[PDB]
Design a protein around this ligand. Structure first.
Ligand code: 1K0
Length: 127
């Protein structure tokens, strides 16, 4: 069994910025989700070998996780807040696509996503 390479977190020729919206995404959005009791399954790429999910990366072709997002934010990988918001949404959607309603992992994602939505509802206007 084999995992894919993780998503890119470094690319020196990708344009990047540090916007006030991106600072909010790190200091408020990521920090809130990361500390949550249900964060742990989402803090690193899905290890499809250790979890014995051999079809995971057959179904999930755009993997994302908060470990990857955390590194992207800390390394100022992004140009804009929409890029980062898309990553969070890709993470949640992958969970819903792969799993079944009412599974524990789906309940965990839902809890995290509720908080994500409440925080992004107050994303600041760009300075
Ligand atoms: C431990 O961290 C994770 C993270 C996950 O996603 C972010 C998942 C995830 O998306 N599905 C599952 C999961 C677990 C079991 C036992 C399942 O039945 C095995 C097939 O008979 C299925 C279909 C999914 N485990 C995760 C664990």
């Amino acid at each position: 069994s084999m995992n894919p390479p993780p998503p890119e977190t470094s690319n020196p020729n990708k344009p990047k910025r540090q916007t006030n919206q991106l600072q909010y995404l790190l200091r408020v959005v990521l920090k809130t989700l990361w500390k949550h009791q249900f964060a742990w399954p989402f803090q690193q790429p899905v290890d499809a070998v250790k979890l014995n999910l051999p079809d995971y990366y057959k179904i999930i072709k755009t993997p994302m996780d908060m470990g990857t997002i955390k590194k992207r934010l800390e390394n100022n990988y992004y140009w804009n807040a929409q890029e980062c918001i898309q990553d969070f949404n890709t993470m949640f959607t992958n969970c819903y696509i792969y799993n079944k309603p009412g599974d524990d992992i789906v309940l965990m994602a839902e809890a995290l996503e509720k908080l994500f939505l409440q925080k992004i509802n107050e994303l600041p206007t760009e300075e």
